[PDB]
Design a protein around this ligand. Structure first.
Ligand code: GST
Ligand code: MG
Length: 294
């Protein structure tokens, strides 16, 4: 009769489990982000850990809006970014996002919105995140490609029908854009497309594809090399095929015990694919929150 709302406690429970698993202190602006999460409707929450050798960076949480209210979802997400940026010790520079959104932006061409954080004990190295997926939008695909410095060799990876765009805003004023072209299982398993992958990507980067239903590549001037994203169909497959170190294994062993998706994402570098032990890896786990009449 009325629109349903998922209780904030259910969403914050999932985030709270992650905070407790990895000893996350209330870094700024985690409390503001939890209030933001409380105000949302149906969503998917993604928690992740970034492993660098024996160092775990676990204060990484993204929210994906499940409904299609893209204009209003972007604007509540940006309102979070700007409120967090109000504190005098923080400097956020949203110029690259202002450039992307400039003019008469067509919000009917948006497909997904995500808002998130990656917080560090060193306030300056902390960042806020915004993701916008657009489809069939030539003008704004071109803007994003220009902001991302897409050269040939990289342009071949980008699709025309859809483009997942990420914005990173560091709390010291630095900012970066990232493009994430993706292929679905049905596409990368087709011999035409695989043979084009064989030219731009080593066999090592193609190795996990049988385990996945989605494959993506992160392209950003901020990256040392392209970042490979694998959406594993079965979280239980991970430790059989990837030789991760003890620090990453602690993250994964905890998430093997959690309620949530049966799938997971792993992100790695191609060089870290031609090597014995994986010591630089991001692991992403999620849980969906859906109600009866959202
Ligand atoms: C060393 C390289 C290029 C990749 C290995 C480690 C890695 C997966 C890095 C990107 S970390 P970040 O940009 O914070 O993660 P996203 O939100 O973009 O997924
Ligand atoms: Mg990135």
């Amino acid at each position: 009769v009325f629109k349903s709302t998922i209780a904030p406690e259910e969403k914050l429970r999932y985030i709270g489990n992650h905070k407790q698993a990895f000893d996350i202190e209330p870094l700024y602006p985690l409390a503001l982000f939890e209030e933001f999460v409380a105000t949302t409707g149906d969503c998917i929450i993604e928690c992740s850990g970034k492993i660098k050798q024996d160092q775990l960076y676990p204060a990484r949480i993204d929210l994906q809006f499940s409904d299609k209210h893209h204009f209003h979802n972007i604007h509540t997400s940006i309102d979070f970014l700007k409120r967090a940026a109000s504190r005098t010790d923080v400097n956020l520079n949203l110029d690259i996002l202002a450039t992307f959104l400039a003019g008469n932006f067509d919000y009917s061409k948006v497909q997904n919105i995500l808002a998130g954080i990656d917080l560090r004990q060193n306030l300056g190295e902390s960042k806020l995140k915004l993701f916008i997926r657009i489809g069939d939008y030539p003008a704004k695909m071109a803007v994003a490609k220009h902001l991302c410095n897409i050269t040939p060799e990289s342009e071949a990876m980008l699709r025309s029908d859809t483009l997942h765009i990420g914005f990173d805003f560091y709390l010291d004023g630095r900012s970066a854009i990232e493009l994430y072209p993706e292929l679905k299982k049905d596409e990368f398993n087709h011999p035409f497309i695989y043979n084009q992958l064989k030219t731009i990507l080593s066999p090592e980067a193609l190795k996990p594809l049988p385990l996945c239903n989605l494959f993506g590549i992160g392209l950003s001037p901020a990256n040392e090399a392209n970042v490979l994203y694998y959406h594993l169909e079965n979280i239980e497959d991970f430790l059989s095929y990837f030789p991760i170190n003890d620090t990453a294994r602690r993250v994964h062993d905890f998430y093997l015990q959690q309620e949530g998706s049966r799938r997971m994402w792993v992100a790695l570098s191609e060089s870290e694919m031609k090597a014995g032990r994986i010591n630089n890896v991001n692991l992403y786990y999620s849980k969906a929150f859906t109600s009866q009449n959202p």
